[PDB]
Structures are given as structure tokens and as C-alpha cells.
């Protein structure tokens, strides 16, 4: 039994890739997201990613195929170097602390804008030690929570 919140989460994830809202993720759009995160896949490499889950053979990724992609490639858990890779995405200035301002920017860059109230809520929930920023240990620890 899927909840509507689960469905909403899948939709948001899908829409991050599907920037033109046409219902399919193309190599261009997959590429755009991975380039926003510092990666440089080739067009062929992006096509290969699509091919793996491209069950109807049309060359692009639709909603159910994207679910399959996440099932396979969100296969459990952030190891260590990948958690650390993610931290680096958010800690833009490399100083070891994610500021509210940093988080807001990175999130806008990905393509999900949220009220500064929301961003501050994210910082505040994760900020265990009280300094108003999120260090690596706190970034790691927020990932365990409900």
C-alpha cells in the first residue's frame, strides 16, 4: 500500500529530472542533473543509463521506469565516501559546515526551490550542536531519521 506522501516523493524526484514536465526523462535532462552535481557523463553513457530501465524500448525514461531506476540504484544505503561526496555538494565553500545560505543555493541549483522557512527548518532539525550550521557528523546523522 503506497501512501500519497510516498507518491509525492517519487513525483518530486521525477520532476527534478523532467524539467519540461512532458512525462519523459531524456539524455539531456539526465545529463543536466548530473552536471549540476559536478559529473560529466557522455551522451552515450547517459543513454546506457536509460537503456537499463528502458522497458518499453522508446529511448527515454517514463514514470514507472524511473521507479525501477530508483529501486535498483537507490538500493539501500549511503556507504561513506558517497555520504561524504554528498556533503561536499552542499558545503559549497568547502569549510566543513553547511550554512542555511549554502543549502538554499544548492537546492535551487538542483531545481527545487523552497521557502527560506523550509531551508531554515532543515538546518535547525539537523543542527544538533547548536551553531546554526550542519557539519559532517550532523549531515550523516540526519540521514537516519524518520
Amino acid at each position: 500500500q503506497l501512501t500519497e506522501e510516498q507518491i509525492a516523493e517519487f513525483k518530486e524526484a521525477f520532476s527534478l529530472f523532467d524539467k519540461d514536465g512532458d512525462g519523459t526523462i531524456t539524455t539531456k535532462e539526465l545529463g543536466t542533473v548530473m552536471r549540476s552535481l559536478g559529473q560529466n557523463p557522455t551522451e552515450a553513457e547517459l543513454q546506457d543509463m536509460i537503456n537499463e530501465v528502458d522497458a518499453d524500448g522508446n529511448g527515454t525514461i517514463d514514470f514507472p521506469e524511473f521507479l525501477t531506476m530508483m529501486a535498483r540504484k537507490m538500493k539501500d544505503t549511503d556507504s561513506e565516501e558517497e555520504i561524504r561526496e554528498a556533503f561536499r555538494v552542499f558545503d559549497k565553500d568547502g569549510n566543513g559546515y553547511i550554512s542555511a545560505a549554502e543549502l538554499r543555493h544548492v537546492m535551487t541549483n538542483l531545481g527545487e526551490k523552497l521557502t527560506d522557512e523550509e531551508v531554515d527548518e532543515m538546518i535547525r532539525e539537523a543542527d544538533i550542536d547548536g551553531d546554526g550550521q550542519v557539519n559532517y557528523e550532523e549531515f550523516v546523522q540526519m540521514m537516519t531519521a524518520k
Binding site: 516523493e9 548530473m34 557523463p41 553513457e45 543509463m49 531506476m69 540504484k73 554528498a86 523550509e118
Partner: peptide, 19 residues
Amino acid sequence: RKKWKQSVRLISLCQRLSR
């Protein structure tokens, strides 16, 4: 929602895609 935990997972997704 836990939007931030969700976005970290998506970032990890792209790491795992770019082999």
C-alpha cells in the same frame, strides 16, 4: 517530508549512475 534527506538520496543515485 524530509526534503533534505530525499535530495541526498537523489544525489547518491546520480553518483551510482555515473559509474
